[PDB]
Amino acid sequence: AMLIIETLPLLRQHIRRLRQEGKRVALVPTMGNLHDGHMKLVDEAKARADVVIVSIFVNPMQFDRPDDLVRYPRTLQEDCEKLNKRKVDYVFAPAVEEIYPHGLEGQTYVDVPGLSTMLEGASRPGHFRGVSTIVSKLFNLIQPDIACFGEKDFQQLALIRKMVADMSYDIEIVGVPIIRAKDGLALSSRNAYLTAEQRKIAPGLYNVMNSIAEKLIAGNRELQEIIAIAEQELNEKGFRADDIQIRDADTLLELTETSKRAVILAAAWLGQARLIDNQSVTLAQ
Amino acid sequence: NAMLIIETLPLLRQHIRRLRQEGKRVALVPTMGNLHDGHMKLVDEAKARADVVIVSIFVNPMQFDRPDDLVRYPRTLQEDCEKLNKRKVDYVFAPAVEEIYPHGLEGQTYVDVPGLSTMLEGASRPGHFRGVSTIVSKLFNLIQPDIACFGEKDFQQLALIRKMVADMSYDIEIVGVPIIRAKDGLALSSRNAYLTAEQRKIAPGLYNVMNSIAEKLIAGNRELQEIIAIAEQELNEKGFRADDIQIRDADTLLELTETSKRAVILAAAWLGQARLIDNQSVTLA
């Protein structure tokens, strides 16, 4: 029987008991309005710990603009339905005034430099600060052994990993691979404007990406060439290449002699639909 | 039983893991070295509140190394340790910079407490308190103490750390340790050497006047402007020349309000060639 807690003191009480009981704990952090993606996360956490705690918190701090916030879906009941079905032990679902009793102005924050202002960060001051601050608070609160994040937010995942190192959190950060169709296509909302014919072609993006992985994992380092080949391969299948990038998976900067992991980002158009995907890959030890 | 001194994070990590699974109750005293009897009092308090006492010695480059007026000769790491071995401490953590910040400060994740870090002492030292909260948060995650001791003298630091503990949801008891005082009340201080013998008979009046204020406060008297005015009378008529007497919220370092819970009384007064200085915390009933 799943337990639903909304205040810091109650939860902490349980966190204390769970220690004395010697149970290994996994946290899956979320902002509610859950679906299949999150369920996979939950499976992954259940597989690696004795107890799974899921948090549901729409976190004002990471919201770039005040409108977006107001219009974020809240669906506590169905969220709990899905988590209860999945045999989740604890749901932590506090109100804003429990986490931020006095608003965001004087709130202690945690910032990861560089990672937080590059790429998506540059257009979104404060967003990633919001992400690292709340995860940080959640970590101190729950003290999990393991935490799960989806691989789709490759930047969030790198944010957190860099935080955990720098701030010395003894927590295992587990990147969970996205749900794909049997043919490779990232399952997503965008897959609606795909005509039966474009759907057949769609999986081309993930193949093109895997061809890049193959080349990189072996010792291929002619990056520009690699990328250009990829642009062309996509155009030929019928896409129109929007963007293709290869970066260091930990720093999000350019690959160097010293990178151990690469992340492959690609976006390309199919008729009037713009598919995006990504893939992480191990180049060294 | 023999005191252990650890230079490295992984060795530290190992003992820490071991301490948790023995469920030994752990106390932390973080310091920048150059130890004196002041710190020993912290150690004493920690010993009294915990099974195991850890002291950390680390000259943290993210903060400003403000000088202690009680210290007149610098210390050796071995000296600091000898002190600690006597005072019955279990572990000393003493890493090099490259160990704590193996890649420098540039990309180091930081914890920042708004307002408290930029006011008073912090206005004139950009980045100082940000270095304090960061290293302390990092020590917190690495060590996971149940309690942590800070001295009441550096009161801004103590508020800054309390605010961080609340905001970031650390399950740590922050124990503010009152200053060492002569038998008669007078704060120990280099300044004392500036009194004459006759002025030393009067010096204890500064503590006295301060208790008068505390009692008043504890007794719900919020007429501050005049509480202070009386204290000035009282000191000037004792032979002092009151310079600066203040009462603030100990957690905000701003004014008392209907909701303040703790107050700090801050006082300076001339006696002879000596500008005596003292502070005192008050718990609001």
Between the CA of residue A109 and those of A39, A157, B34, what are the distances in Å?
A: 29, 18, 31
Task: State how far the Cα of A65 lies from the Cα of A27, in Å rounded to an integer.
Answer: 28
Place of tokens 């916030």: A69
B181 three-state secondary structure: strand
Considering only CB atoms, A162 lies closest to which of B109, B140, B169, namely B109
CA nearest to B167 within chain A: A108
CA nearest to A165 within chain B: B109
Q: What is the DSSP string of A169-228?
A: ---EEEEEPPPB-TTSPBP-SGGGS--HHHHHHTTHHHHHHHHHHHHHHTT---HHHHHH
**Tell me, what amino acid is at A68?**
D
Q: B16 with B144: CB under 8 angstroms? A: yes
Task: State how far the Cα of A144 lies from the Cα of A171, in Å rounded to an integer.
Answer: 7
Task: State how far the Cα of A164 lies from the Cα of A173, in Å rounded to an integer.
Answer: 8
CA A143 to chain B, closest CA, distance in angstroms equals 9
Which chain B residues have a beta carbon less than 8 Å from that of A167? 109, 111, 137-138, 141
Q: A176 with A255: CB under 8 angstroms? A: no
Q: Please name the method used to determine this structure.
A: X-ray
Helix axes B224-236, B205-218, angle to 10 degrees: 160
CA nearest to A101 within chain B: B167
Q: What is the DSSP string of B203-220?
A: TTHHHHHHHHHHHHHHTT
Is residue A210 annotated as involved in ligand binding? no
**Tell me, what amino acid is at A64?**
D
What domains can be seen in chain B, in order of their start residue? 1-181 (3.40.50.620), 182-285 (3.30.1300.10)
Which chain B residues have a beta carbon less than 8 Å from that of A162? 107, 109
Residue B240: CB atoms within 10 Å: 23
Q: A50 with A26: CB under 8 angstroms? A: no
The DSSP call for residue A233 is H
Is residue A36 annotated as involved in ligand binding? yes
Residue A3: CB atoms within 10 Å: 13
Query: Residue A254 — left, alpha, or beta (φ > 0 → left; ψ -120 to 50 → alpha)?
Result: beta
Considering only CB atoms, A169 lies closest to which of B111, B141, B171, namely B141
Residue B216: CB atoms within 10 Å: 18
For an interface test with A, which of B17, B28, B109 has the most A Cβ atoms less than 10 Å from its Cβ?
B109
B29 three-state secondary structure: strand
Task: State how far the Cα of A111 lies from the Cα of A207, in Å rounded to an integer.
Answer: 36
**Tell me, what amino acid is at B94?**
A
Q: A239 with A266: CB under 8 angstroms? A: no
CA nearest to B168 within chain A: A137
The DSSP call for residue B67 is P
Closest by alpha carbon to B175, among B17, B47, B24?
B47
Which residues sit opposite A280 in a β-bridge? A263
Residue A4 phi/psi, 5° resolution?
-110, 115
H or E segment to which residue A266 belongs: strand A261-270
Asked if A167 and B138 come within 8 Å (Cβ–Cβ), the reply is yes
Structure tokens, A127: 């967003």
Task: State how far the Cα of B274 lies from the Cα of A252, in Å rounded to an integer.
Answer: 58
Q: What is the largest CA-CA distance in chain A?
A: 61
The DSSP call for residue A122 is G
Structure tokens, B9: 């994070």
Task: State how far the Cα of B271 lies from the Cα of B200, in Å rounded to an integer.
Answer: 9
Task: State how far the Cα of A6 lies from the Cα of B53, in Å rounded to an integer.
Answer: 34
Q: B245 with B228: CB under 8 angstroms? A: yes
CA A84 to chain B, closest CA, distance in angstroms equals 27
CA nearest to B133 within chain A: A108
Task: State how far the Cα of B268 lies from the Cα of A94, in Å rounded to an integer.
Answer: 45
The DSSP call for residue A120 is G
Q: Does A108 touch chain B (CB under 8 A)?
A: yes
Q: B38 with B70: CB under 8 angstroms? A: yes
Closest by alpha carbon to A235, among A272, A208, A199?
A208
The DSSP call for residue A241 is E
Residue A197: CB atoms within 10 Å: 11
Q: B245 with B266: CB under 8 angstroms? A: yes
Residue A107: CB atoms within 10 Å: 22
Closest by alpha carbon to A101, among A53, A56, A60, A68?
A60
Counting other chains too, the contacts that B195-199 makes at CB distance below 8 Å and 24 or more residues apart are: B195/B271, B195/B272, B195/B274, B196/B272, B199/B239, B199/B271, B199/B272, B199/B274
Which residues lie closer than 8 Å to A278 by C-beta, 6 or more apart?
Answer: A151, A152, A154, A209, A263, A264, A265, A266
- Going A40 to A46 to A48 to A52, the CA torsion angle's sign is positive
Task: State how far the Cα of A240 lies from the Cα of A212, in Å rounded to an integer.
Answer: 17
Place of tokens 């106390």: B27
Residue A187: CB atoms within 10 Å: 13
Which chain A residues have a beta carbon less than 8 Å from that of B109? 110-113, 132, 162-163, 166-167
Task: State how far the Cα of A45 lies from the Cα of A169, in Å rounded to an integer.
Answer: 18
Q: Does A258 touch chain B (CB under 8 A)?
A: no
Between the CA of residue B217 and those of A69, B227, B265, B285, what are the distances in Å?
A: 43, 9, 10, 9
Q: Which residues of B175-190 are buried (b: 16+ CB within 10 A; e: fewer)?
A: bbbeebeeeeebbebe
Q: What is the DSSP string of B185-253?
A: SPBP-GGGGGS-HHHHHHTTHHHHHHHHHHHHHHTT---HHHHHHHHHHHHHTTT-EEEEEEEEETTTS
Resolution (A): 2.7
Q: What is the DSSP string of A29-69?
A: EE-S---HHHHHHHHHHHTT-SEEEEEE---GGG-SSHHHH
- Output Rg (C-alpha) for chain A, integer angstroms: 20
Asked if A113 and B133 come within 8 Å (Cβ–Cβ), the reply is no
Q: Which residue stretches of chain B are H helix?
A: 9-21, 37-47, 77-86, 97-100, 128-143, 155-167, 197-202, 205-218, 224-236
Query: Residue B5 — left, alpha, or beta (φ > 0 → left; ψ -120 to 50 → alpha)?
Result: beta
CA A156 remoteness from chain centre? 6
Asked if A136 and B168 come within 8 Å (Cβ–Cβ), the reply is yes
Considering only CB atoms, B109 lies closest to which of A137, A166, A170, namely A166
Which residues sit opposite A243 in a β-bridge? A267
Question: What dihedral angle (degrees, nearest 10) is formed by the CA atoms of B14, B15, B18, B19?
Answer: -140
Count each helix (H run) and each strand (E run) in chain B, helices first. Answer: 9, 10
Asked if A110 and B110 come within 8 Å (Cβ–Cβ), the reply is yes
CA A52 to chain B, closest CA, distance in angstroms equals 20
Between the CA of residue A150 and those of A26, A54, A81, A156, A281, what are the distances in Å?
A: 14, 14, 21, 9, 15
Q: Does A97 touch chain B (CB under 8 A)?
A: no
Is residue B39 annotated as involved in ligand binding? yes
CA A216 remoteness from chain centre? 23
Which residues lie closer than 8 Å to B238 by C-beta, 6 or more apart?
Answer: B202, B205, B209
Chain B segment 169-188 residues within 8 A of A by beta carbon are 169-171
Q: A137 with B169: CB under 8 angstroms? A: yes
H or E segment to which residue A237 belongs: helix A223-237
Q: A276 with A259: CB under 8 angstroms? A: no
Task: State how far the Cα of A24 lies from the Cα of A50, in Å rounded to an integer.
Answer: 5
Q: Does B119 touch chain A (CB under 8 A)?
A: no
Q: Does B109 touch chain A (CB under 8 A)?
A: yes
Task: State how far the Cα of B150 lies from the Cα of B166, in Å rounded to an integer.
Answer: 16
Task: State how far the Cα of A12 lies from the Cα of B206, in Å rounded to an integer.
Answer: 43
Structure tokens, A199: 């759907």
- Output Rg (C-alpha) for chain B, integer angstroms: 20
